[PDB]
Specification:
The structure is cut from a larger assembly and holds chains A, B, C and D. Chain A is mostly helical. Chain B has a 5-stranded mixed beta sheet with strand order 3-2-1-4-5. Chain B has one domain. In chain B, a hairpin with a 4-residue loop joins strand 1 and strand 2. Chain B contains 2 helices and 5 strands; from the N terminus they run βββαβαβ. By secondary structure, chain C is mainly alpha-helical. Chain C contains 3 helices and 1 strand; from the N terminus they run βααα. By secondary structure, chain D is mainly alpha-helical. A two-stranded antiparallel ribbon of chain D has the order 1-2. In chain D, helix 1 crosses helix 4, helix 3 packs across helix 5 and helix 4 crosses helix 6. The chains are: A mainly alpha, B alpha/beta, C mainly alpha, D mainly alpha. At the B-C interface, helix 2 and strand 5 of B face strand 1, helix 1 and helix 2 of C. Strand 5 of chain B pairs antiparallel with strand 1 of chain C, so a sheet runs across the interface. Chain B binds one RNA strand through loops. It is classed as ribosome. The entry lists the keywords 70S ribosome, dirithromycin, antibiotics, cryo-EM, ribosome. The entry is titled "E. coli 70S ribosome in complex with dirithromycin, and deacylated tRNA(iMet) (focused classification)". Chain A is 30S ribosomal protein S18. Organism of A: Escherichia coli K-12.
RNA sequence: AAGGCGGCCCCCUGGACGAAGACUGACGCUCAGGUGCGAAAGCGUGGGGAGCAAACAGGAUUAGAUACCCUGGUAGUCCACGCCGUAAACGAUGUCGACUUGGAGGUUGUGCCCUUGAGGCGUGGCUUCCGGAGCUAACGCGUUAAGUCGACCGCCUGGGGA
């Protein structure tokens, strides 16, 4: 149920520089971590999330 | 030589040298100084002291511009990343922001081969 | 690793915060990792050795 | 001393003035265990270096030492396969020792007649901030300022 | 299946696994010769060529330095279509099936219970580490066996020459 349009939820799993946080830090399952990575990449494409802190 | 009061300190902290360039907000360079141009060659050039005196001499190359508040953009892994910032703050400068702008390729070009030293 | 020196903070604490942020971002480790080419077999062997020594 | 922490030996005060500085100066100037020969030299030099100025003796000797005392010196180091010279801060006891040793070697490298005269002239030069002892101190400070990057 | 496969999206497409059933009814295992796939390098034709970089040139180091180090740099690395058919192509461990104490994990289904909880208890598939009997020259393997067996295949017969 992870949606790339849920930026409020996706921002909890990215650092201050926009990088995805590892599953060891947030303690999320591997399956939902993969879903989160896919959703974050899609949201980066739609310019809803930044690729980096620069641009 | 007019008054800016708003600058950026571009620090290029390479492994072998340290280049400090003070520009305005737009990016036009006003003055610059390096570790190799401050009387350090070879082993002394890649030291935090050389970077410190380079940041001291670069801050003097912009005294005619009257800069009061300036930004810091650090780039590179070499020494003098924090030494230049300290030398800039000690030179009577209000450091407003510090930013790391080291270029990170998202797995782009192929780097050179390992040195078998 | 953007650090905005907020009001009522000295320069030294801002510099130490900048260093802490740049080390938690891992930019120096990455730029030291990317300066020479590491063969796929070399990086696989290194990852395997690190995963093995992470057992104590 | 790989493990040896060592104390300090008892140096006796000067018989004429009661100074440990002058006793160590006589010890440094002494050769072949001839302490009476060195004491006469030091006393003649201090007398001759007294009338010139006017601040008694001990004071003139300390004024001469103040100009030869090195604040920072370099220590050779072999780490990066080459001659590293790290400028280290000199301790006060080593400061006085270096100053006195430099003054003695500078006085012995002079063309005056007697060692008492050489000492008197070297101390007067040091008080005037010149000579070869002050030259060596400036050499050391120069070498330290050159390698300040290696602190 | 192996070689291998790493941004995101779409189109075509193979295999594996699980739940509860229905169906066919030995249709199975292995396989000389045969065929197919087969990293990298290399070859042919046509493109492309930023970075890296055999050959090559220069600067160093050295007794020498046809090397390590430095500055460049062609083929190549990239794409399409063919060829090559080799690797420490490794788990140095052929495939298929049955049986034999355990522990901690990972990953992926599924079932049960005021679901208390990101819960507990079962039940499959793949997978990592340790270890018992046993086996081994020892190292070690140890239910994913190098243990106990069965079927078939490939291979070995002192070191060089090779």
């Amino acid at each position: 149920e992870i949606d790339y349009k849920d930026i409020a939820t996706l921002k909890n799993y990215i650092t201050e520089s926009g990088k995805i946080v590892p599953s060891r830090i947030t303690g999320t399952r591997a399956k939902y971590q993969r879903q989160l990575a896919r959703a974050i990449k899609r949201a980066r494409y739609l310019s809803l999330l930044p690729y980096t802190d620069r641009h | 030589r007019k008054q800016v009061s708003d600058g950026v300190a571009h620090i290029h902290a390479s492994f072998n040298n340290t280049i400090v360039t003070i520009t305005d907000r737009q990016g036009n360079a006003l003055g610059w100084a390096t570790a190799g141009g401050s009387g350090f060659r070879g082993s002394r050039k890649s030291t935090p002291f050389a970077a410190q005196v380079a940041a001291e001499r670069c801050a003097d190359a912009v005294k005619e511009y009257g800069i009061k508040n300036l930004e810091v953009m650090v780039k590179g892994p070499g020494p003098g990343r924090e030494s230049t910032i300290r030398a800039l703050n000690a030179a009577g400068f209000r450091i407003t922001n510090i930013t790391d702008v080291t270029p990170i390729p998202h797995n782009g070009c192929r780097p050179p081969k390992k040195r078998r030293v | 690793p953007v650090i905005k020196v907020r009001e009522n903070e000295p320069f030294d604490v801002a510099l130490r915060r900048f260093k802490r942020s740049c080390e938690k971002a891992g930019v120096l480790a990455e730029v030291r990792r990317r300066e020479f080419y590491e063969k796929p077999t070399t990086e696989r062997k290194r990852a395997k050795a690190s995963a093995v020594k992470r057992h104590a | 001393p790989r493990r040896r922490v060592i104390g300090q030996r008892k140096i006796l005060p000067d018989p004429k003035f009661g100074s440990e500085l002058l006793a160590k100066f006589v010890n440094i100037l002494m050769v072949d265990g001839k302490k009476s020969t060195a004491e006469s030299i030091v006393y003649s030099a201090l007398e001759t270096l007294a009338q010139r100025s006017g601040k008694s003796e001990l004071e003139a000797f300390e004024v001469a030492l103040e100009n030869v005392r090195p604040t920072v010196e370099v220590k050779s180091r072999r780490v990066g396969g080459s001659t590293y010279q790290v400028p280290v801060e000199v301790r006060p006891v080593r400061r006085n020792a270096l100053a006195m040793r430099w003054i003695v070697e500078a006085a012995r490298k002079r063309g005056d007649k007697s060692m008492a005269l050489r000492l008197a002239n070297e101390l007067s030069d040091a008080a005037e901030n010149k000579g070869t002892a002050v030259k060596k101190r400036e050499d050391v400070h120069r070498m330290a300022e050159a390698n300040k990057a290696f602190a």
